[model samples]
Target: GHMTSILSRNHVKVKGSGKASIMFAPGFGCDQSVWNAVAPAFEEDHRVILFDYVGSGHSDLYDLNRYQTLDGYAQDVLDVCEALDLKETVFVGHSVGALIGMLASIRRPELFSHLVMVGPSPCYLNDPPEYYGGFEEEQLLGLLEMMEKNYIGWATVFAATVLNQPDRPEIKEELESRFCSTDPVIARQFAKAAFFSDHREDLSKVTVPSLILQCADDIIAPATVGKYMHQHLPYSSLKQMEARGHCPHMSHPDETIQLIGDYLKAHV
Candidate 1:
């Protein structure tokens, strides 16, 4: 009864009406058009949900050896917030969709309130001394041998040698139009469930109201993993983006939409 045919999969929406809703979530072989430059600045208010996960854009294609983990993509973000009934949400997310929005807000924290996390990395290995998730195991086995040689020419030469921009031609035409709409074997099994998932003890059981934007000069979530996720996120807020890479909302979309609309209007 629970699986409900993988909760009838499929999704894609962008309606609006102000009551406050924002749910993005895209990265790792992206989809939902990677929120085309920050979804038109929250489409005239809010109500901006977007999808594409299962096997990439326009979803549906499953069975990649029984949906490779990350809790099966965090149960597809808890079945898209229970088919969009979405109670209280904000969730932005980006890299690995911020660990699938911190594992769907730790299995539904009343359907979320706030959390922006861009270029996040709860742990991509490297537990030395303590942690340093900047990849190591032989540089993620040479990035899985350069994504099995030629995953869309290693995602357009790592998005033009680490996210081009140098004056920005629409940030290389919006990352070559969302990297030519993914699907290179679901972007190499979502880059092996985003660099072999770890979650750093689920960031001290996330209490929501987060913002950790970080980026600036991301060599894959750098700045010391955004100061170790603002010191284990117990209600966080970090925002340091001067725009350097790892998708700065497609390379500085107006400074990532005015720092996510001034941190959701000073904490929504």
Candidate 2:
């Protein structure tokens, strides 16, 4: 009874005949489809599950008033796992989804056997001495205002601004399409949750073996943020990849998949 409800709620799809259940959670901008190039490789030996969060993709979020915190999304991951009766699980998440998986694993360590984070960051604000989150408090507020006027462009401009590789327009084009499909009002709330909320305090609670895949030249979550997560997250291995930008899974899917595949081979 509970199984089908949450599964349907999140537009969950299951495939493959593997022993381990591997779930892929989409990042902030795109939906589950963002895992197109990265997830198929695991299907031969792992049960692959993909779903969108409350506001993104086909999920309904017209009534949910709160968007300031990401704790609710973390609950979404847990609920879906419970509903699906998933076991021997490996949770793979990107960007905001990474932190979402982190929070969920901390909540229920026994549910996940391994945790994979792609371009994950624990915080987005600068702390001056002990931490440098890549953004000043004032800059975050500026982006919040920027989104209010036109949030869809946030993804479009984000590609060139962060990725900044003129030779690659395919990455930019696809991301723009993803953002254009999202509602601007919904994007505003999501931007707030992504930028303002801090999950640094919760990293230590994670008990599962985890992998942190950091992009080489990511502007949003810089090397400092990734290293900080490595230090704080217990039983985590950080791998710095050659891929650039925050969405390396999109720009460099092969490298991302290779690293994740190898992690599974070694751990799971």
Candidate 3:
């Protein structure tokens, strides 16, 4: 019998001690370390799990064929859960990771107790008339074009756009560095998967209770999108936050922690 190699393939890290398990999934151009500020808060009362996707962070497995779609990334989440034999776990995901977690949870609802989505968008391209996903297709294509021509420049622009907190420039620089360090090929693919795909139909299919933490002024996933998700997600609780930008976990970790912690306490 051969043992599963998923743990090594995903660069899995587990800590803390409790019956409850919280798995932190990072967004595009990010790894598990992005959860450092937020994950520790739950350690005392829950088991914390962190991992990078196949082509992200220190993960060893990076197949161009496998990572072309969000399905592949979703598989990574399932594989890690299977490798660890987890059950009724809490999934705390940021940005695109939130959507990935939603897909995974839909496939295996038994594995998740609650879903905490931070700046999530099921569709980044506007469907118009009925839906507004914050961006036009042309804008996204322009973004991809910028990424191809100047990766560092794209990273800088992305950092400023998402961070949105000029008063605290340190986090913006940190996010920029993370984006800069990501492999360009993988980053492009990840971006395509995140921005190009639409998973709106899949939202209601998710059986797990979800916590939607809607940021005040998130350009990436606007308030309308969050409201749309809340309406379609079957069992979802939407909390409008004072935090601005696309990354509350970094920009306002304390508030992120508080909202997530409170939601978990009430739900799970």
Candidate 4:
């Protein structure tokens, strides 16, 4: 009810029996459209839920100021659940969506049957000898600066510079397509929360059955971070996708969907 004013395109679809539903959350700067390729795969047998977060996609632009922190975004998750009257469902979150799912699960574990985190990282900044989250403060500042200089330019350069590999071209294309999904100002603020916010302690408190699908060569969420999550989360399992970039679901939907399906079949 409260989210109706914030989330514009609040949409839901029931596929098979409507016995069990799964909520799919999009990554930063992107919208529900990113899940288009993989949504059909789940529609045949599972009730699939998809929505855009405030400040992204078709959401109310006026709610931009209300979405300044991760906690705010997590509250949006709660709002979506209440609006849909969802219970005992699965949460399939990508990137920042994964963090949002973790927080939401912590708030109401009974509301979720399982959590499928794709390309997740609890913390982006490294914490010295204790953790290696693959980012330093200066590096983060540089990223922010780059984002300020030109979001599109920075995204293009990042796709090529950091994620250089055999799949670099595909990664570039995906990044290009979704790079400007959000307004530049909103993208900057979201990037700050994504890259600078620390959620290391949140890892230990998560109690839901979790499956982390980590891209083997993801520049954002590295392999070690996935292992760290598996080690910290009490009820978590890590599956490393052989794919080479951050957004494997967008870059290689077939393989990513298969990985998700296999995990669901085994766990649920």
Candidate 5:
């Protein structure tokens, strides 16, 4: 069937048998496996769905034109939902995954009951006097160049930078390995889309309730970015976690899981 085709195309995986559906979308430079720590906690109660974006994880299919912009990645989320016939799903997205989920929800609001953004950033560039997105254009361009030329080194440095959990070096190692293994070409393209694309105006278009999980410290999506998201996003709540760094799902999975679980119980 066509649904089967789409599921396989995205390398979709499912677990649990429950009334409510939930989908976990991974951030840039990672795959569905990134949700390993937090996703299982919801397995007993949620119809948990995990899938790779076209260029990430085990998904083998990739189209150059389709992935040039984030909307194409958003289509991957939409396609996964249509394939599974999901309704009123709780979408939990990390990093760039958060924005992709937003784009998907905006396209099909009825499909999502809530949007959980873990260290989400609508834009990475700083539009000063109006918004502070944590990065300057030159800085981002330099970061992108590092990915283009010194990708492996970038992975090592980036893993430490985003994780920022010096006490937990294992997490940094694990994240760096994930970053190191991705296809260089695809990685660069994904980095460009993730960093360059801005979805600031798209926030209000979303009708579903959104939970912004801001980490105590994040280089990518700073506290300001989370607040910015809350300000522009209608029906949104920003919660600052005690956890530090950008990849709380990996570094502080327990706290991350607990916050998401609490929000789901109270709001959705």
Candidate 6:
């Protein structure tokens, strides 16, 4: 009862049944609503929980300097787990949230023993002869310059950029219009943290069983990046999904739900 009350205060919603719980983490530009299409899939037999990071969703307060790094968002995930006293949790994260999940699990392994990452990456920049993270440093800067120029219109261009499909206008309209809209200021702050920070070394610190769901055509975290993450994370398994964009759960909810479900059944 107390968990429910506290979670409600923090705009965390929980429902469903079973002893196990599923904690869904929303990435940049959106809140917990990002998982609405897929989270209900397990409510019949599993506990479903959702929450907003301080800057997104119904949450409206946060320290700008503190949150200028991914570690602060990861702390929010940790705070949620601690407040609820969660155990045997299947932590599901998307985009930047995926990295947040890995860092949180590494920091507190007992709270979340399982992880499901959708379109995750340890780095977004190329590392010369060793690793190619799909983007050149200059290109990343260009993208940021493009965002700074667009400002409030970043989401529309962002949705267009991540998916990069002429036929997938439907996905863009729904991504920010209904659920995951971000404030321009917070968006830029989070953008600096998510894209620039490298977490490749931290992957090996995660000791729990985890799943990395790689999209077939997502430029944000491509297939090569997925393979690199698999090679780094000790007990992590990689599954290449048939989705075309970064938001697989949005564009291909069925496939996204299926992959996450399979990981839970096998590991959790």
| Local accuracy of candidate 5 as per-residue lDDT tens digits, 1-268 | 3899888888889999788978999998888999999999999998899999876652245678888788988999999999998767889999999999999999999999999999999999999899998899999999889988888999888888889888999999999998898887888888898899989988889899999999987888889899999999989989999999999999889999999999988974
* Residue-level lDDT tens digits of model 6 in 1-268: 3556547545777889988999999877777877879999999988898988875542354567767888888887877787777765888999888898888888888888688889988999988787878898898887677667776466666677677666977888876463334666677778888889899888889897878898887778878889998998999888988888888878889999888887777764
Query: Candidate 6, overall lDDT?
Result: 0.80
Comparison by TM-score, 2 against 5, better one: 5
Q: After superposition, how far is residue 251 of candidate 4 from its true place, in Å?
A: 1.4
Task: Name the runs in model 4 displaced over 4 angstroms.
Answer: 1-17, 57-60, 161-163, 166-171
In angstroms, the error of model 6 at 136 is 1.5
Q: Model-by-model lDDT, in order?
A: 0.74, 0.83, 0.89, 0.78, 0.89, 0.80
- List model 1 lDDT by residue over 180-202, tens digit each: 45666666676777787788788
Give Cα distance to truth, residue 226, candidate 1, Å.
12
Per-residue lDDT of 267 in model 2: 76
Q: Which 10-residue window of candidate 6 scores lowest in summed lDDT?
A: 55-64
Question: In terms of TM-score, how similar is model 3 to the real structure?
Answer: 0.96
For each candidate in turn, give its C-alpha RMSD to the true structure in angstroms.
17.6, 1.7, 1.5, 2.3, 1.3, 2.4
Predicted structure 1, TM vs. truth: 0.33
Query: Clashing residue pairs, candidate 2?
Result: none
lDDT of 3 by residue, 47-130 (tens): 999999977652233678877889889988999988888867899999989999999988899999889999999998888798
Error of 6 at 264 (Å): 1.6
Question: lDDT score, residue 255, model 4?
Answer: 83
Sliding window of 10 residues with minimal summed lDDT for model 1: 1-10
**Reference-based TM-score of each model:** 0.33, 0.94, 0.96, 0.91, 0.97, 0.92
